[PDB]
Amino acid sequence: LPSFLVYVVSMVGETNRAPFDLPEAEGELVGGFHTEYSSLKFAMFMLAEYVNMTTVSALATTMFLGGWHAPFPFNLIDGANSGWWPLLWFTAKVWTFMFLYFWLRATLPRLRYDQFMALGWKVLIPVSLLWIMVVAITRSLRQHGEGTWAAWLLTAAVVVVVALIWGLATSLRRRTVQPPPPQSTGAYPVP
Amino acid sequence: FLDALAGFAVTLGSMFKKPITEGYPEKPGPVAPRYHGRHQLNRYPDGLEKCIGCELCAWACPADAIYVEGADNTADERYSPGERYGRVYQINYLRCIGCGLCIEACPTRALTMTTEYEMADDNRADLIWGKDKLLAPLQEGMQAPPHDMAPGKTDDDYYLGNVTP
Amino acid sequence: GLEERLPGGILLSTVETVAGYVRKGSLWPATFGLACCAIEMMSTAGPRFDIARFGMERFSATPRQADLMIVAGRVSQKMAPVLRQIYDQMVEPKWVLAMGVCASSGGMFNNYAVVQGVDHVVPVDIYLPGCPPRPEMLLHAILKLHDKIQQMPLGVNREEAIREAEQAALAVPPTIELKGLLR
Amino acid sequence: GDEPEIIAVRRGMFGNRDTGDTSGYGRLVRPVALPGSTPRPYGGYFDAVMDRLAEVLGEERYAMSIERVVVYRDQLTIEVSRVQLPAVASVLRDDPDLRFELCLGVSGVHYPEDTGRELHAVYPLMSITHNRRIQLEVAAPDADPHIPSLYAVYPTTDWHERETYDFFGIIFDGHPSLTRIEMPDDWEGHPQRKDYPLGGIPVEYHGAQIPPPDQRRSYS
Amino acid sequence: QAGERIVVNMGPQHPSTHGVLRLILEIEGEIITEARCGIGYLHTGIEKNLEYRNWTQGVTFVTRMDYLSPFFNETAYCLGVEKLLGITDDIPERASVIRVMLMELNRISSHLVALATGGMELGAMSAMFYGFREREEILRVFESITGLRMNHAYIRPGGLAADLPDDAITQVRRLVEILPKRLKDLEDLLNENYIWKARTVGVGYLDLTGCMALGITGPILRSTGLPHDLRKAQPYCGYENYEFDVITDDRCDSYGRYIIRVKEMHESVKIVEQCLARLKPGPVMISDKKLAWPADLKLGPDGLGNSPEHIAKIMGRSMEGLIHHFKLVTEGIRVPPGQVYVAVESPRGELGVHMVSDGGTRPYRVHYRDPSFTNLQAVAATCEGGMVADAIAAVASIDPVMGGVDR
Amino acid sequence: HPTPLPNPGVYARHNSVDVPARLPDGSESPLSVSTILPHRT
Amino acid sequence: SAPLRILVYSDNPRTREQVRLALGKRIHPELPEIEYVDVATAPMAISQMDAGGFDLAILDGEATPAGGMGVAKQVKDEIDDCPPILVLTGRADDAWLAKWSRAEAAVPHPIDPIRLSDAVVSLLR
Ligand SMILES: CC(C)=CCC/C(C)=C\CC/C(C)=C/CC/C(C)=C\CC/C(C)=C/CC/C(C)=C/CC/C(C)=C/CC/C(C)=C/CC/C(C)=C\CC1=C(C)C(=O)c2ccccc2C1=O
Ligand code: SF4
Ligand code: SF4
Ligand code: SF4
């Protein structure tokens, strides 16, 4: 799950889609990169964006959602994972990811690209790097029979990560600020 | 805190609600009864035009969107009660701002504002609507405007409302 | 464009009708609201109406991707050069909808500061009364423009239509000479 | 001066600038006078504000600076003498008892018939601390439209001095850059001056046209 | 140095610049090093054109600057005209109550537009649609009351253009009932959203000292913690009779201003509920026939027009009534010579009106100190030093309406 | 300090940021155009 | 020797008549003969100037569907070596836009025959 979440965030970033949407940023850069482009050149930029969306959604389906394997309600059906049905399952999962894309676009404002980079380097990269070590240690331990240690370490690591990420989101990004002093211009008496 | 994700609930929930869009043009939405739509020149029940050509509507227009010229109601050709009628009446709808001061100005209720609003053209001139376009359609019991007043009636009777088809 | 080099006949007629159908849909407006009429365009996009139902949801921020320039507001003197620049920086085919009385003819503001009609600086395809025009009126004007686009000719038909429209327009008397019934 | 400020003289009944639609009514002569100096017991807090202003300013300086005091419709307008405007503005802003920290802008008005005082600039000042409001009125001749810019005292006057210069030509000397803000820098004339024509065009109609309202008759 | 600095026109034609605002930004990389504002791309000469139309025609002009606050413009104009006339105490209580109700619904509408356009400028695509849904409810109410969706000329010197329709009160009650629920949707999208806060919090900072120096007002000023509101200080239209709290915040940044607007919408809903309670049957226009607008609009099968009763009175029975109708409609009232300054609390701050009458039937000089015009002077302070993205948020927080800016 | 610095001059045929605004005396306003730009247009 | 060809663009036939009346077959006996090409629609004027062979274009700033100033700006931005453009302005305050149109000369309505003739001579000389 940690790797899945990091990959999801990072692919939404990769496809230049909201809430990242930074290269285009209609509200800030008019048309962003594809300004000065018209006709099928702009059309091909958008086509590339959507094909990349499909590619990353399919890759997410492959790695994390069992690829084309039938989901649980249909997994019990005989032959669901055979014939052409796997195509249906893969399409369904890809389109759930597309739905997630559209949902994010509808719901979230777009970040400042510096804020996105701060997210990537102060949260995503550290979280994924720690998760790799945690997964490696856990797998090595269970391979060597120390299952209880593996489970304890996994739970403790995820708890610590969710605590520290919350600290970053609320403590480092403190919701408090200092006051201000007066200057040349006369100022009214504050409440 | 799930509160920070509250927005996702709003959009998702609104997915399963029926869209609130009005179905214009096939099923146009209901405009307010008091809406300031197209001006309309009304007739008396006998068919005579109400517009006496006083130009008060044009007087009060802040955009000079009404041009009116009066003429005498000669006995041979009478269009409205009294001795004046609006011979030429044009509204430049590319200058009209729908303020409604014209209908407030009119002393005969000759000028009203219907709820009809659809208006557009590719030519500037075509939106200068003359008397022919603005006159209300001739209803049942109304005669052609060029006719004498109702028998045994006078302008005062028309204004007091004592006239019938 | 090679579509213009296509010879007349069923081929050119079908190209014209397909192009008209395609262009009436996806008629992306330019993100170019002015004055109070811009609020009415936004309302037209708002949920109560839906500009999107006509394929016009994408308000192209850049003029390059914009097909329709809904002026939608009063054009001040200082703004006319900017409006013309935006219109030029759009690419063919281009259409201009003079939304509101100010955009169409200067409206109530018959004075120095206003241009007295968008058409003074860019060709206007549809004039839309109102101050502002309620969103249904905007949709009506947009559908009228759709009808105009659908019948838009191409190539040799375009040239012949231009010549015929010229021949017709050369004869129409000016509005000042329509003295019907004036004393 | 002490008499009320005559801004225009209208001749003839019915507010008609022209000769008269009906004979015999054009002989009335009524000067249109804006209110003159108010008798000293100003109502409300105006009396206190003027007492404090006269205390902070020296009697000589107060006499030199305050040309008139007009309490009209329970609103206080200090007709301040030009040149002294920065001094009185500083006094009003800085003095603890006056403390008019918030200048709301600068409005230009033109009185072409007001000899030597054609151009007026109005400074609506508000003191949030004391919750008080006043206006300063500074008059400049059309021939010498210069006025001291209050930019040092009230920075907000920028874009208001610029706007009023654009629309009236009042030269707020000392302003960091008194460039046109509304009109193009290439524009000729100052639109809101009364002598500047409205610049409209006739409204077209089938067979006719209506000239702009400034050309047509009026009975102001 | 110069080699590392671009200068770019945020320009009139830009999604966040409301089409007619020209932010000229000197940027080092993407940090706004310097800011200038080309203004007047939406100038209209409304102030001069007013001078050639009588009173009660200038209402139609003033309502078309700051077009997002039409009722505030109209109320300021009419308060000024009445003050020159000296009839501010003669306005019927019903007229004042309706004026307050309409200004508060208009505040809700204007804040909705501000939040919608700000969210869209900041990528909150659904914010615009939800805000405009609520605004469309409010505009249905306005259309029913006045017959126009926008640029209403409903408030007239001495009262209102016409009395409320029978169903208007029920529609306004339905608003008071549903509007907070709908506003909950828009608040959920933005209020506590992490991205929204990150995008607005700490952006466009402007201390109280800056607000005073530049004469800023409205949500920008009250984001500094100063509870200054012309409705409480210098009350007008009988605002003194309503129990409402002046919304203020201490963040001094864009998020503080956004929260102030959100809370002002709820305060306006409370004030409208109070207006509904206080609303009583009675005249909506001064009783003085020498000044009262003579028209009496009513509906019929033909449409909206002068009521048949008024037509009968003026064309059949009353010679004095006919003369008064003719004169007050045509050339209008003549205001005694004078010079007045009247201020209201428009959604963007102190909307001031300096109005001068030379005794004639036309306003000698009408000038609007539109709060947007002064607020835009804060762009240099609120944008310089931040990124262009932060500049977008700061400008949206200023919430300028270029119609009121240029006029 | 010059609030927002004066906007660059807007002339017919010239409205770029390089153009200098016109002072009442007819001279170009130095503050109107950023110093980095070469005075021209 | 070549007849100077002048393009007269105006939706109003009376403005074209006035232009073609102030100017004649010869502006002066020292000048070459003048031939007039009347155009009522902006597309037609643009097509004509695309074909070139014009020595002067008179564009009515008051043209209804597409004003003359817009056409002047368009032609100077689209036709290389386009002829000098004379614009007819419907009001004094349009002068600013007349400058923006980059028209070599501007003549206010109503068209003074002598002023128009003098401007045309100055542009052709
Ligand atoms: C190439 C080829 C032939 C291939 C073969 C195969 C083939 C044919 C196709 C392959 C696939 C391809 C290429 C398909 C083509 C289509 C394609 C590539 C994509 C384009 C379509 C697309 C991207 C669609 C989705 C985009 C989308 C979701 C758009 C919606 C955006 C929205 C919601 C816009 C609404 C915004 C809005 C309300 C605008 C109004 C703003 C305006 C105009 C006013 C200005 C204005 C504003 C903004 C104020 O802030 C303001 C504030 C206060 C007072 C005044 C104002 C004011 O005046
Ligand atoms: S419509 Fe009414 S106001 Fe206008 S001329 Fe006719 S009667 Fe008079
Ligand atoms: S709606 Fe107003 S502007 Fe339009 S014609 Fe009537 S009075 Fe004139
Ligand atoms: S037509 Fe009316 S609403 Fe539209 S921009 Fe002009 S004045 Fe504003």
Side-chain angles (χ1 to χ4, degrees), chain A residues 1-25 27 29-48 50-75 77 79-132 134-142 144-145 147 149-165 167-170 179-182 186-187 189 191, chain B residues 2 4-17 19-26 28-75 78-115 117-131 133-139 141-142 144-147 149-152 154 157-165, chain C residues 1-2 6-146 149-150 152-157 161-162 165-166 168-178 180-183, chain D residues 1 4 6-10 12-16 18-54 56-58 61-63 65-66 68-73 75-78 80-96 98-112 114-136 138-141 143 145-160 162-187 189-203 205-219, chain E residues 2-3 5-27 29-65 67-88 90-92 94-120 122-127 129-133 135-136 138-165 168-176 178-180 182-183 185-186 188-191 193-206 208-239 241-242 244 246-269 271-272 274-297 299-308 310-316 318-369 371-383 385-389 391-398 400-407, chain F residues 1-17 19-24 26-27 29-38, chain G residues 2-10 12-16 18-24 26-29 31-32 34 36-49 51-61 63-79 82-103 105-117 119-124:
Chain A
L1 184 62
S3 179
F4 169 72
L5 292 170
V6 174
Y7 173 80
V8 163
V9 176
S10 192
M11 66 181 180
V12 178
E14 186 268 327
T15 50
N16 310 308
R17 287 291 299 204
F20 306 119
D21 191 43
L22 305 165
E24 177 175 346
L29 306 180
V30 190
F33 69 94
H34 63 63
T35 310
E36 302 291 330
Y37 278 96
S38 74
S39 186
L40 293 194
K41 287 173 280 171
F42 164 82
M44 287 166 36
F45 286 122
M46 300 291 118
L47 162 61
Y50 278 92
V51 171
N52 288 330
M53 293 176 70
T54 308
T55 304
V56 300
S57 299
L59 183 58
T61 302
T62 302
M63 294 183 287
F64 299 110
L65 278 294
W68 47 255
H69 289 308
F72 160 81
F74 313 105
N75 194 44
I77 308 303
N81 300 301
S82 312
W84 301 84
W85 298 101
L87 179 60
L88 171 61
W89 312 135
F90 165 86
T91 302
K93 296 194 218 74
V94 164
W95 276 101
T96 65
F97 276 103
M98 293 290 220
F99 176 93
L100 176 62
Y101 267 116
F102 309 149
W103 199 12
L104 291 165
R105 181 171 179 171
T107 50
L108 297 180
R110 94 170 64 76
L111 281 156
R112 309 194 316 232
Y113 65 95
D114 77 319
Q115 293 169 339
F116 174 44
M117 185 179 288
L119 167 67
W121 276 81
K122 296 184 174 182
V123 177
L124 297 187
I125 283 173
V127 166
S128 53
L129 207 65
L130 292 165
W131 179 240
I132 291 156
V134 169
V135 168
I137 296 159
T138 302
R139 182 164 272 259
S140 182
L141 285 168
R142 62 185 58 267
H144 287 285
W149 291 358
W152 169 88
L153 174 61
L154 188 148
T155 51
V158 296
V159 165
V160 166
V161 165
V162 298
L164 186 58
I165 197 174
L168 284 166
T170 66
Chain B
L2 291 175
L5 306 182
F8 287 97
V10 169
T11 53
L12 185 70
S14 75
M15 187 160 322
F16 298 118
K17 298 179 187 291
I20 63 171
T21 71
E22 281 149 29
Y24 185 93
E26 299 84 4
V31 307
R34 200 177 276 191
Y35 180 66
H36 289 181
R38 298 205 304 261
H39 300 75
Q40 170 173 92
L41 288 168
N42 295 110
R43 307 174 186 280
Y44 286 112
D46 61 6
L48 284 180
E49 305 177 1
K50 291 196 176 189
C51 179
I52 56 181
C54 64
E55 309 187 36
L56 292 179
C57 59
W59 201 307
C61 189
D64 300 326
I66 314 184
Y67 184 93
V68 191
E69 199 169 46
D72 302 69
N73 279 306
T74 177
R78 168 175 295 286
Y79 299 81
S80 72
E83 57 184 272
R84 190 189 293 188
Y85 76 102
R87 186 170 209 237
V88 169
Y89 195 104
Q90 306 178 35
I91 299 185
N92 193 323
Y93 277 108
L94 296 184
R95 293 283 183 178
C96 176
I97 56 150
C99 60
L101 273 71
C102 48
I103 54 160
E104 300 183 39
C106 181
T108 63
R109 174 161 263 266
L111 203 72
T112 56
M113 297 188 79
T114 66
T115 49
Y117 51 78
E118 287 183 331
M119 185 180 288
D121 217 332
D122 60 8
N123 175 24
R124 184 194 290 284
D126 282 313
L127 288 168
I128 296 161
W129 275 28
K131 191 183 177 72
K133 299 148 159 286
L134 296 163
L135 271 164
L138 207 67
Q139 309 179 21
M142 282 172 190
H147 71 279
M149 286 194 232
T154 187
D157 294 328
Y158 284 84
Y159 302 123
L160 293 163
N162 309 327
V163 291
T164 55
Chain C
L2 298 176
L6 194 70
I10 67 178
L11 268 293
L12 182 57
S13 179
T14 48
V15 167
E16 276 184 356
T17 192
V18 167
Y21 181 79
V22 165
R23 284 160 168 168
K24 67 155 67 70
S26 83
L27 185 69
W28 300 345
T31 310
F32 185 62
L34 278 53
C36 70
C37 277
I39 309 310
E40 285 303 329
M41 294 183 287
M42 272 183 293
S43 303
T44 310
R48 176 182 172 184
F49 313 91
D50 197 14
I51 200 61
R53 285 177 303 119
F54 311 86
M56 294 177 70
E57 67 281 17
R58 174 171 161 71
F59 279 71
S60 171
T62 65
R64 311 315 197 160
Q65 293 97 22
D67 298 300
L68 168 62
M69 176 204 264
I70 312 176
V71 174
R74 63 185 181 271
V75 183
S76 71
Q77 293 278 10
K78 201 153 75 178
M79 180 66 165
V82 180
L83 190 147
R84 179 75 212 196
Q85 186 69 3
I86 295 302
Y87 173 80
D88 280 317
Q89 287 187 339
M90 321 207 308
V91 302
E92 313 317 317
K94 299 181 289 193
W95 302 276
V96 184
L97 177 63
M99 166 195 212
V101 295
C102 293
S104 57
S105 80
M108 182 179 72
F109 306 115
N110 188 3
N111 61 15
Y112 64 99
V114 184
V115 173
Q116 302 311 305
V118 163
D119 54 30
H120 278 44
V121 299
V122 293
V124 173
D125 295 282
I126 292 290
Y127 297 91
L128 169 55
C131 187
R134 66 177 304 131
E136 298 98 323
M137 296 171 42
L138 175 58
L139 298 178
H140 179 65
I142 278 167
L143 289 163
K144 205 172 184 74
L145 177 60
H146 284 192
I149 289 171
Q150 177 54 90
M152 179 194 50
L154 297 172
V156 295
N157 299 333
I162 288 163
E166 176 64 26
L170 279 163
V172 304
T175 55
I176 186 63
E177 287 191 351
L178 276 59
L181 300 186
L182 281 169
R183 298 283 295 290
Chain D
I6 77 184
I7 55 165
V9 181
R10 60 184 62 184
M13 293 177 70
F14 312 146
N16 182 0
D18 291 330
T19 67
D21 315 292
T22 300
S23 169
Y25 289 93
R27 199 157 290 198
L28 171 66
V29 180
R30 188 163 78 268
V32 183
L34 287 181
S37 312
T38 300
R40 192 55 183 75
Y42 314 139
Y45 59 82
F46 305 138
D47 200 15
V49 167
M50 294 297 102
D51 293 344
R52 183 63 183 171
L53 186 55
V56 178
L57 298 172
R61 278 218 301 156
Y62 175 91
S65 307
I66 311 312
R68 290 180 183 271
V69 170
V70 183
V71 178
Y72 187 65
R73 299 296 191 250
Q75 301 196 331
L76 166 58
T77 305
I78 311 177
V80 164
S81 67
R82 181 167 58 153
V83 185
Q84 300 303 329
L85 173 63
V88 301
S90 303
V91 166
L92 287 155
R93 191 196 71 162
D94 299 343
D95 180 73
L98 301 168
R99 185 40 57 76
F100 290 95
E101 59 272 350
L102 189 89
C103 174
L104 287 150
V106 180
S107 313
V109 61
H110 187 211
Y111 298 109
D114 191 356
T115 52
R117 293 164 58 87
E118 291 82 356
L119 296 163
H120 288 202
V122 180
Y123 298 79
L125 309 181
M126 194 201 186
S127 173
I128 298 103
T129 64
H130 305 300
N131 182 19
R132 294 178 180 173
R133 294 186 68 95
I134 63 172
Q135 287 80 63
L136 317 185
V138 180
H146 291 64
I147 291 183
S149 58
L150 283 187
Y151 185 66
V153 187
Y154 290 116
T156 191
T157 57
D158 196 7
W159 292 25
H160 289 273
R162 282 179 61 203
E163 176 196 41
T164 57
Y165 158 67
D166 196 357
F167 290 139
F168 297 94
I170 296 165
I171 309 305
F172 294 88
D173 54 25
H175 184 281
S177 294
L178 199 72
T179 64
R180 288 188 185 262
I181 180 162
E182 294 286 2
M183 296 291 110
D185 294 72
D186 191 25
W187 200 261
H190 297 295
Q192 295 185 343
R193 295 176 54 90
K194 295 300 196 168
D195 50 9
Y196 190 100
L198 186 63
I201 64 171
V203 177
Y205 290 99
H206 294 171
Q209 59 188 18
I210 301 178
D214 70 332
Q215 302 186 8
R216 307 195 315 269
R217 204 155 181 64
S218 67
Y219 295 90
Chain E
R5 297 281 179 70
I6 296 166
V7 58
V8 64
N9 301 268
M10 185 64 72
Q13 195 276 313
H14 185 288
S16 79
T17 63
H18 322 296
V20 297
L21 171 57
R22 183 184 175 190
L23 264 72
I24 305 98
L25 305 180
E26 183 188 320
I27 70 188
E30 201 152 332
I31 287 285
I32 307 310
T33 303
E34 198 155 272
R36 300 174 160 73
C37 293
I39 302 296
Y41 293 96
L42 182 50
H43 184 56
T44 306
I46 298 168
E47 286 180 1
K48 192 186 183 66
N49 216 324
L50 282 166
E51 305 172 12
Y52 296 90
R53 304 293 180 183
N54 64 23
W55 315 91
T56 77
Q57 274 177 334
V59 182
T60 66
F61 282 74
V62 300
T63 189
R64 280 162 175 75
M65 68 192 63
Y67 41 80
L68 293 179
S69 78
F71 290 117
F72 285 95
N73 297 314
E74 301 162 71
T75 302
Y77 180 83
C78 293
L79 290 172
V81 177
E82 294 150 16
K83 185 164 280 286
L84 278 178
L85 290 167
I87 61 165
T88 54
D90 301 350
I91 308 306
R94 186 178 173 85
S96 292
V97 167
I98 296 310
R99 282 170 179 201
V100 174
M101 163 188 317
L102 287 172
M103 293 183 286
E104 292 308 327
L105 284 174
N106 193 16
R107 192 183 310 281
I108 301 164
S109 176
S110 178
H111 287 347
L112 279 171
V113 176
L115 299 195
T117 197
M120 185 180 288
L122 300 178
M125 182 179 72
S126 292
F129 291 92
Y130 284 70
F132 265 85
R133 153 178 159 252
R135 183 170 196 263
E136 278 298 340
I138 299 178
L139 287 197
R140 281 203 197 85
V141 159
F142 285 170
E143 190 197 326
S144 75
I145 291 170
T146 75
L148 284 166
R149 281 173 52 82
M150 185 180 288
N151 300 317
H152 315 281
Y154 180 72
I155 298 168
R156 302 288 179 73
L160 310 173
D163 194 7
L164 300 187
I169 300 92
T170 75
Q171 296 187 269
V172 178
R173 303 217 71 97
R174 181 182 162 279
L175 280 189
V176 168
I178 202 76
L179 199 52
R182 298 212 193 295
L183 288 172
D185 296 329
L186 182 61
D188 285 349
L189 278 161
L190 303 180
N191 280 16
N193 185 320
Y194 285 129
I195 299 182
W196 183 253
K197 295 178 77 172
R199 193 68 195 263
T200 52
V201 172
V203 174
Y205 179 91
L206 183 67
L208 194 152
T209 310
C211 292
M212 295 298 102
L214 295 174
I216 312 295
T217 49
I220 303 153
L221 170 57
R222 287 189 265 106
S223 76
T224 71
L226 187 71
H228 179 241
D229 190 302
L230 277 296
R231 298 173 287 178
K232 294 297 192 166
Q234 311 294 311
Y236 55 91
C237 286
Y239 263 110
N241 304 302
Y242 300 84
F244 67 100
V246 176
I247 300 308
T248 184
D249 190 28
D250 51 15
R251 290 183 182 87
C252 310
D253 58 19
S254 300
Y255 185 79
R257 293 180 273 267
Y258 157 87
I259 285 297
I260 275 164
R261 278 190 264 274
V262 165
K263 287 179 179 183
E264 278 182 353
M265 296 196 249
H266 294 284
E267 286 299 303
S268 299
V269 167
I271 296 160
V272 171
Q274 289 167 36
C275 295
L276 286 167
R278 200 189 312 282
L279 188 59
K280 291 294 197 292
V284 295
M285 185 63 72
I286 50 175
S287 56
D288 183 1
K289 297 291 182 69
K290 299 292 183 180
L291 299 171
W293 186 243
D296 177 24
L297 288 180
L299 283 166
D302 61 358
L304 186 66
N306 267 318
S307 71
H310 183 68
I311 302 295
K313 190 198 68 171
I314 70 176
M315 308 291 318
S318 185
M319 177 76 249
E320 277 84 322
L322 181 57
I323 287 175
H324 281 71
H325 174 84
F326 190 112
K327 293 301 303 192
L328 299 173
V329 175
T330 51
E331 71 179 5
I333 57 166
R334 51 185 64 249
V335 174
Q339 175 184 25
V340 172
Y341 196 94
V342 62
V344 305
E345 180 67 12
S346 87
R348 288 160 188 81
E350 170 158 333
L351 165 54
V353 176
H354 175 236
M355 182 180 72
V356 188
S357 175
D358 69 324
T361 55
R362 304 174 165 181
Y364 187 81
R365 165 61 166 144
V366 166
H367 177 263
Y368 281 17
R369 192 278 189 182
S372 300
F373 185 87
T374 306
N375 293 2
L376 271 172
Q377 294 182 305
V379 297
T382 53
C383 299
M387 320 214 291
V388 69
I392 300 304
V395 172
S397 193
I398 288 161
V401 60
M402 303 307 297
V405 180
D406 306 357
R407 300 154 281 114
Chain F
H1 309 94
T3 60
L5 289 164
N7 59 0
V10 176
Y11 304 69
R13 305 183 182 175
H14 297 292
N15 58 23
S16 50
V17 300
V19 181
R22 180 171 292 164
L23 292 171
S27 67
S29 167
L31 297 180
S32 69
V33 64
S34 175
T35 58
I36 70 182
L37 294 156
Chain G
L4 299 170
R5 291 176 77 247
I6 301 188
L7 187 83
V8 183
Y9 166 62
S10 187
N12 184 330
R14 307 305 171 241
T15 63
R16 303 198 305 267
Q18 281 173 22
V19 164
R20 204 159 59 256
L21 188 85
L23 320 177
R26 300 195 177 234
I27 317 309
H28 293 299
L31 274 289
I34 311 300
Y36 300 94
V37 176
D38 276 26
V39 294
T41 67
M44 183 60 192
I46 294 298
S47 76
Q48 286 279 28
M49 293 177 71
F54 280 105
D55 302 277
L56 181 86
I58 296 169
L59 310 180
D60 185 4
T64 290
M69 306 192 231
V71 177
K73 188 70 174 74
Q74 180 165 343
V75 298
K76 279 196 174 303
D77 283 339
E78 294 188 344
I79 297 89
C82 70
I85 310 300
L86 187 148
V87 166
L88 316 174
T89 61
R91 46 163 177 172
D93 300 81
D94 270 338
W96 190 81
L97 282 181
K99 290 180 48 49
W100 160 82
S101 81
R102 284 153 175 86
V107 178
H109 283 287
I111 308 165
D112 176 352
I114 307 303
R115 189 175 177 171
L116 187 79
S117 184
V120 169
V121 168
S122 80
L123 293 182
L124 297 172

